[PDB]
Amino acid sequence: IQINQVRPKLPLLKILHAAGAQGEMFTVKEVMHYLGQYIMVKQLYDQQEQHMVYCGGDLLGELLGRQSFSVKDPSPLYDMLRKNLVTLAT
């Protein structure tokens, strides 16, 4: 297996699939692409303040353990990725 591949855990993979991803293993860039598409297409960001993501009530909020987060202050999102990505480079 390639060193730059990661395997998203079940609930994260569900999100990525729900945004148009195919398969089980991805680069971190691909994961971010599909996660971004999920947020963008469902329009979870506040249209009036687009760095704010209102994720509570959605699977993404469940996974994050937060009602909302800011894209400018990504640590809660990065916490979620740390816990939901299986990697070989770590």
Which residues of this chain interact with Mg ion, rule CB under 5 A? 21-25, 75, 78
Residue nearest to Mg ion (CB): 23
CB 37 within 8 A of CB 14: no
- Cβ distance to Mg ion smaller for residue 29 or 78: 78
Shortest distance (Å) from residue 19 CB to Mg ion: 10
Residue with tokens 């937060």: 66
CA distance to 2, 60, 61, 75, per residue, from 41 (Å): 30, 13, 16, 23
Residue type for 56, please? G
Shortest distance (Å) from residue 35 CB to Mg ion: 13
- Cβ distance to Mg ion smaller for residue 11 or 23: 23
